[PDB]
Amino acid sequence: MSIEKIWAREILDSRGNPTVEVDLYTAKGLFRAAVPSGASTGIYEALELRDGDKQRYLGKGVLKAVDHINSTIAPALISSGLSVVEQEKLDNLMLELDGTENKSKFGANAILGVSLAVCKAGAAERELPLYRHIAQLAGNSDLILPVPAFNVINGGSHAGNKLAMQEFMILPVGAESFRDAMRLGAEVYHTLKGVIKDKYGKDATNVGDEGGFAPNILENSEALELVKEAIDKAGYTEKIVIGMDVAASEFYRDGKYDLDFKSPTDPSRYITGDQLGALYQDFVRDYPVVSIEDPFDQDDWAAWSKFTANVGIQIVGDDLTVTNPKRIERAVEEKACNCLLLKVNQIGSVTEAIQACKLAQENGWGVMVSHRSGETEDTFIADLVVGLCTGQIKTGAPCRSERLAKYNQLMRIEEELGDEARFAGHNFRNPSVLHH
Amino acid sequence: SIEKIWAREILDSRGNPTVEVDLYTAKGLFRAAVPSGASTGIYEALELRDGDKQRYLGKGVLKAVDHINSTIAPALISSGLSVVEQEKLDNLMLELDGTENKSKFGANAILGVSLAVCKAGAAERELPLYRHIAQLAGNSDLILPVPAFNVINGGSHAGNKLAMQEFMILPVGAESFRDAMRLGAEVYHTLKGVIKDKYGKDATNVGDEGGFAPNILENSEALELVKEAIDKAGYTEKIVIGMDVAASEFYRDGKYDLDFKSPTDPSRYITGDQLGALYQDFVRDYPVVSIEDPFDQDDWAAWSKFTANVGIQIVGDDLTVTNPKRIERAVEEKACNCLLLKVNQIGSVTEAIQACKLAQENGWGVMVSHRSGETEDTFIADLVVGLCTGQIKTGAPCRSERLAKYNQLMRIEEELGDEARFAGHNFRNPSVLH
Ligand SMILES: [Mg+2]
Ligand SMILES: [Mg+2]
């Protein structure tokens, strides 16, 4: 009566690893989605189910997840006779069939793939663009194009350099529109590539998983100066600001923090959380840093709360919250942060990710929709960030098409929305104040 | 027939603007995007760029988009020709431009419409795109290509000392295309590990095509690295090596400089004969089965001499630039035995199909090719199957502007079912399987 067919297969993601793609068929046609993947397993993440056969793709095959869709999830959904518009009921049906709290039986990658395909097929049955269907599933009316946060400089475990902080990003908060923000981002990206080529050599301009550069930078402040200089030389000093992903859990060491964790271990150099907090206040004074992700360890709750109570910038939970609602509730209760990173495959279904998002927003938080380091040609999260009206998305450098595919789709959405398109701009934290 | 044609500016995989085209018929919306091209080639179809330094550092494509929206779109809608009539639609755009290299509207403007028309035509004929392409080309067979995976980079766009531009791997002995992706990915990841140990984490960042560029000086060192990864991955029997030398990049004073990236001195330059001698040692000592642009784009006597003296595939890229008059000359003088087919170098579906059939009539192989700047578009995946050329090079199995083509080939193979055939060891002449 609704779903004609559901067929899953194994494709390759942007790192050359297998992942789940799902085809769903209705009288309106073929609706296809693919699943992203992080670099490592997180303890609070919903389970990404992998084959573990070390011969085939080093044990990263997803044949087990694909067979669960084709042999179990697909018949159950078709036989339920539920319409594809009933996102919550079909999601609930899969959560019940799985019957585990972390989706360890089918894998969040199996369950998500169907959830995304159902959402796409539901939008066509409603005769709505995907982003408007999502807005209705979430209870929004006034769509917003987000500020993109473009990865440009990498450190931490992403790089062989001494730089201990993981990612430095640029946000074109001063752009006139989302299409204008893509232009400002690309021009600074290329300006910065030129600067790196001259200062560090041609070798220093190859790219990492998310399309950013990882030159041999030694000091965290030298990276910030590099980014500031590319923005200034591109001519956009006041229109482009900086975001950072510290990923502080990476250099967390016995209750302290090792800002040189890639040099031979020396405990005497570890600094306390309060010492790390003071270093951030110096960055925020000397550089236009408006957002910091994971400034402290994912269990260092006391440091988060003290920093968030004492600075006025955006403080993003990533490893702290893990798109996990029980963790979010504790983070809200302790005022640990004021923005949620939203990674849909960390929670495993469209419904639960919309609920995670409404949990944060109803408590005054920003929400930044996020990519994974292993992405696909899928663009679902571009429609998601518009429908959820969060005003901010980080989905890579303006380089590599698993990133540009999202940005290109957002420009198409802006074009479709026309005179009713509102760009979040300097209100990326609170886009609700914009619409009239 | 065509309800609407609407072009917009999008960003390609390097972050530069390119042309995307929406085409509406009564069957729905058909979307296609154009890869990065050259705007100043001498034989190439030329892409139109804006050159407005206030926008994308002069790289905008607003002019091309305007040519589509203001001129090509009403003309083609006015024609009343159905979307199936690929060749009549393509000739109309060719006549409207009225230049051989498409420098009025831009090769990027003409191709984007051409691709969108083709996708609309498939649906109108109730055929998947690759079957529609087979019919436009006169083919009744369908063959999955052997993929050529870029893995190591040198030449002009790598900061190392390696003169030669790209080393690829071809899983000729895989059981199918799906198996061929597994083999290529597993060797690619093995290589990443070898490179991280030998050279360091930083040396595993990727170039435009997803391949690596560690700091190696001699080309033999690069070939050993590929062989070592193939070996450790366990596929010495199943994977061979392709090369793209891009020798035009180091052609100096009628001679060849294999250290052109280091401070100059003509004393170290070597003749075409000496370069050909080194290729023969390469072919003797490593499983190299294909070499692209071994000599300069106009050193015709070096091409003809080398091709007469080896058994391997010799691919023209800068030699032929997908240009029929350049191709005829290469045929005449036996310069090479394989055409690298870059569809945006020619400018339309119909012309690219003609160029491919021209090479194939003369016993040449045809290698369908990506560009440095690609998009999420997957057209060339359906193209290489529809033309049955048996080989495609569209990147390392890394970066999704590359994997999108490869993933689409896996989908096509699953659709073909028991009819799906993998070119395998006949990647040069897939027609022996017909
Ligand atoms: Mg993070
Ligand atoms: Mg070439």
Side-chain angles (χ1 to χ4, degrees):
Chain A
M1 174 99 203
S2 199
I3 311 173
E4 269 155 50
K5 192 188 215 191
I6 286 163
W7 181 253
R9 72 185 59 91
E10 209 185 34
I11 66 168
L12 291 198
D13 74 6
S14 47
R15 273 195 294 239
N17 295 134
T19 190
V20 166
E21 173 180 81
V22 172
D23 286 357
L24 196 157
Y25 287 86
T26 70
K28 296 217 161 57
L30 203 172
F31 301 94
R32 162 170 299 147
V35 175
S37 162
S40 142
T41 293
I43 196 170
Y44 301 96
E45 305 206 30
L47 186 96
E48 167 187 273
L49 163 54
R50 301 271 182 190
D51 288 344
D53 167 12
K54 319 264 76 175
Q55 309 267 123
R56 195 170 169 279
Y57 286 110
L58 257 283
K60 290 187 181 158
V62 300
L63 289 179
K64 268 146 192 261
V66 161
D67 178 68
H68 283 140
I69 296 170
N70 292 334
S71 297
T72 303
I73 302 189
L77 269 60
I78 288 164
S79 70
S80 93
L82 290 160
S83 166
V84 280
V85 302
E86 305 271 275
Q87 186 70 38
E88 181 174 322
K89 289 196 217 234
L90 293 148
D91 278 347
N92 286 349
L93 190 43
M94 296 194 280
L95 273 47
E96 235 277 359
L97 285 179
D98 173 280
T100 67
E101 226 68 4
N102 68 344
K103 307 168 172 63
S104 276
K105 164 161 188 164
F106 298 145
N109 47 342
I111 287 166
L112 180 66
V114 176
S115 190
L116 299 174
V118 159
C119 201
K120 299 196 210 227
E125 209 74 52
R126 302 278 296 126
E127 288 154 39
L128 290 172
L130 179 54
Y131 55 82
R132 174 70 71 188
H133 178 55
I134 291 159
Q136 293 188 357
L137 289 173
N140 307 315
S141 325
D142 304 297
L143 314 180
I144 279 271
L145 279 125
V147 179
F150 299 113
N151 165 298
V152 290
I153 294 294
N154 296 284
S157 327
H158 292 358
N161 48 30
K162 239 86 152 184
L163 203 53
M165 278 147 201
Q166 193 166 269
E167 299 141 36
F168 296 82
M169 304 170 248
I170 50 160
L171 284 70
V173 289
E176 304 275 341
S177 67
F178 187 85
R179 269 161 299 182
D180 194 55
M182 301 291 327
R183 186 186 50 99
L184 270 51
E187 290 178 17
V188 175
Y189 182 78
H190 291 298
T191 301
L192 171 66
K193 177 171 27 171
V195 166
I196 290 170
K197 191 211 197 148
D198 294 321
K199 305 185 155 203
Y200 299 95
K202 215 147 174 235
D203 43 314
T205 75
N206 296 307
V207 305
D209 280 336
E210 310 168 6
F213 309 114
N216 205 347
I217 280 156
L218 318 193
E219 290 268 36
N220 277 310
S221 84
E222 163 192 32
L224 287 163
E225 211 94 55
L226 184 56
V227 171
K228 179 195 168 163
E229 172 201 318
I231 301 173
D232 285 13
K233 256 196 37 156
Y236 296 118
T237 293
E238 315 249 41
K239 301 174 66 108
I240 298 171
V241 300
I242 299 182
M244 292 164 69
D245 188 0
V246 181
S249 307
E250 292 289 304
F251 50 82
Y252 187 63
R253 304 276 183 272
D254 314 354
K256 269 152 161 87
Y257 294 94
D258 186 353
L259 286 185
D260 201 337
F261 75 97
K262 294 181 274 182
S263 294
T265 303
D266 177 18
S268 86
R269 81 202 168 205
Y270 301 171
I271 67 173
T272 75
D274 279 13
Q275 284 186 288
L276 182 50
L279 173 73
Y280 298 147
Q281 314 248 34
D282 291 335
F283 290 158
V284 167
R285 177 195 74 237
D286 313 326
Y287 305 97
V289 178
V290 296
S291 178
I292 299 169
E293 186 186 320
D294 273 352
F296 302 104
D297 185 72
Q298 71 186 292
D299 298 314
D300 193 354
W301 288 96
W304 285 84
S305 291
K306 195 197 276 202
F307 193 61
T308 297
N310 280 85
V311 303
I313 57 144
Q314 181 162 262
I315 303 290
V316 176
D318 178 17
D319 278 11
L320 181 84
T321 39
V322 198
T323 318
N324 180 301
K326 330 277 227 273
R327 292 280 278 176
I328 295 174
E329 304 189 64
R330 173 181 185 179
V332 162
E333 211 196 59
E334 314 197 1
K335 311 182 160 51
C337 55
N338 55 50
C339 178
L340 168 69
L341 204 68
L342 197 87
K343 296 176 170 158
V344 281
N345 82 309
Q346 278 188 327
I347 193 48
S349 79
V350 164
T351 295
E352 300 172 282
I354 292 169
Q355 295 168 175
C357 175
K358 292 307 249 187
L359 187 32
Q361 293 178 315
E362 295 186 338
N363 284 293
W365 289 18
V367 173
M368 163 170 315
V369 173
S370 187
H371 62 171
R372 303 310 295 272
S373 71
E375 265 297 335
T376 72
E377 56 268 46
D378 173 273
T379 64
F380 181 101
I381 67 164
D383 283 86
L384 180 68
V385 71
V386 176
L388 296 183
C389 299
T390 88
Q392 23 175 357
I393 181 179
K394 80 174 191 169
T395 187
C399 181
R400 304 178 59 134
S401 282
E402 78 271 2
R403 323 298 155 183
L404 280 321
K406 276 77 158 167
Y407 296 126
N408 285 343
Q409 175 55 16
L410 279 166
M411 292 193 301
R412 295 188 199 99
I413 288 155
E414 189 176 64
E415 181 171 288
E416 197 172 63
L417 286 171
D419 297 331
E420 99 182 86
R422 272 300 228 136
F423 173 65
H426 291 277
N427 292 101
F428 65 94
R429 285 180 76 176
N430 59 344
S432 287
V433 306
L434 289 184
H435 253 273
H436 287 84
Chain B
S1 171
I2 301 172
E3 280 172 52
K4 204 196 281 105
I5 295 146
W6 179 251
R8 76 181 53 84
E9 202 185 36
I10 62 162
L11 293 193
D12 74 4
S13 69
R14 289 195 291 203
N16 298 319
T18 191
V19 159
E20 192 181 57
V21 174
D22 285 1
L23 195 151
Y24 298 86
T25 75
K27 291 267 181 47
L29 164 69
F30 301 94
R31 174 172 291 145
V34 161
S36 72
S39 32
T40 37
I42 281 71
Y43 309 94
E44 231 158 345
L46 294 193
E47 90 181 344
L48 189 43
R49 300 249 166 216
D50 294 340
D52 173 2
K53 290 320 265 216
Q54 318 244 322
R55 272 201 90 250
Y56 286 107
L57 314 177
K59 292 283 276 220
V61 291
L62 299 187
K63 288 172 183 182
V65 165
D66 179 271
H67 286 142
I68 294 170
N69 291 334
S70 295
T71 299
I72 297 153
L76 253 55
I77 284 177
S78 290
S79 91
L81 310 161
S82 151
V83 275
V84 308
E85 300 164 20
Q86 182 70 38
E87 164 163 30
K88 282 164 102 86
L89 281 172
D90 276 348
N91 285 320
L92 185 37
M93 284 185 286
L94 261 53
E95 282 151 42
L96 283 145
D97 176 278
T99 81
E100 40 258 19
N101 58 359
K102 304 179 177 44
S103 48
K104 177 177 270 131
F105 299 152
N108 40 358
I110 292 157
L111 179 55
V113 182
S114 181
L115 302 173
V117 164
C118 200
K119 285 172 204 196
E124 188 69 29
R125 282 232 203 246
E126 280 122 41
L127 293 170
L129 176 64
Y130 58 92
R131 271 185 198 282
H132 180 52
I133 291 168
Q135 283 183 5
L136 303 171
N139 291 293
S140 50
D141 284 304
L142 302 160
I143 305 188
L144 275 296
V146 177
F149 294 116
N150 180 75
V151 288
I152 302 275
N153 297 90
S156 63
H157 36 85
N160 48 8
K161 304 333 294 153
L162 211 69
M164 300 174 186
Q165 180 174 107
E166 82 207 42
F167 299 82
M168 316 152 220
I169 57 177
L170 284 67
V172 279
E175 266 220 308
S176 69
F177 191 82
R178 204 187 142 254
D179 190 42
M181 304 292 326
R182 179 179 174 289
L183 264 53
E186 278 173 11
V187 171
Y188 180 89
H189 294 132
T190 305
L191 180 62
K192 191 179 174 154
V194 173
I195 287 178
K196 197 212 278 190
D197 300 352
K198 205 88 183 142
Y199 296 93
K201 184 148 175 139
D202 58 283
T204 62
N205 288 327
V206 306
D208 285 347
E209 271 147 85
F212 303 113
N215 187 13
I216 79 219
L217 157 61
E218 265 309 8
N219 306 282
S220 62
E221 169 180 4
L223 282 159
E224 289 287 341
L225 202 47
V226 184
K227 190 183 181 143
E228 179 191 341
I230 292 173
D231 185 18
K232 278 177 210 345
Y235 297 113
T236 287
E237 231 57 37
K238 298 175 152 246
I239 294 166
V240 298
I241 293 184
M243 279 167 86
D244 181 355
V245 173
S248 309
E249 287 299 307
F250 49 77
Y251 178 68
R252 320 225 172 290
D253 283 329
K255 210 164 294 218
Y256 292 92
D257 185 17
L258 291 164
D259 220 307
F260 79 96
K261 300 152 164 205
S262 71
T264 96
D265 57 330
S267 146
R268 76 162 173 252
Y269 294 11
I270 65 158
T271 73
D273 280 4
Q274 301 174 276
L275 183 56
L278 170 76
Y279 297 150
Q280 310 217 231
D281 301 345
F282 284 164
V283 163
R284 213 181 47 235
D285 301 344
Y286 304 98
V288 168
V289 304
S290 175
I291 305 197
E292 175 182 328
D293 283 333
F295 306 95
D296 180 72
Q297 33 174 1
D298 276 293
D299 194 3
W300 288 90
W303 284 77
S304 297
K305 183 177 191 288
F306 187 71
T307 294
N309 286 350
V310 302
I312 65 173
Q313 175 162 263
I314 308 296
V315 187
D317 175 20
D318 286 324
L319 178 78
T320 32
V321 295
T322 324
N323 178 288
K325 273 73 221 171
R326 290 291 283 198
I327 286 172
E328 286 161 277
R329 181 182 187 179
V331 174
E332 286 186 29
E333 329 198 352
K334 268 169 90 312
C336 60
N337 58 34
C338 181
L339 171 66
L340 198 84
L341 197 73
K342 290 172 171 163
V343 65
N344 77 319
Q345 265 189 330
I346 211 156
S348 59
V349 174
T350 302
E351 272 169 306
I353 285 196
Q354 284 173 5
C356 169
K357 265 162 94 284
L358 181 70
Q360 280 172 335
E361 278 155 19
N362 293 106
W364 284 18
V366 175
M367 176 166 278
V368 175
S369 188
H370 64 168
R371 308 303 302 262
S372 278
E374 276 285 343
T375 78
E376 52 268 43
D377 192 280
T378 60
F379 185 90
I380 60 166
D382 305 273
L383 182 77
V384 67
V385 171
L387 304 176
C388 304
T389 86
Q391 44 191 328
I392 182 158
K393 74 159 196 188
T394 177
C398 175
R399 308 174 51 131
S400 291
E401 77 270 14
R402 321 296 161 184
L403 288 312
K405 277 74 160 175
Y406 294 130
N407 282 333
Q408 177 63 359
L409 288 169
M410 295 203 286
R411 289 184 206 100
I412 288 172
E413 162 163 90
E414 156 198 290
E415 210 160 66
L416 292 176
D418 298 63
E419 147 180 33
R421 295 153 115 230
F422 183 61
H425 284 100
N426 286 288
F427 71 101
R428 298 174 54 175
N429 59 342
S431 76
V432 301
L433 272 52
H434 279 175

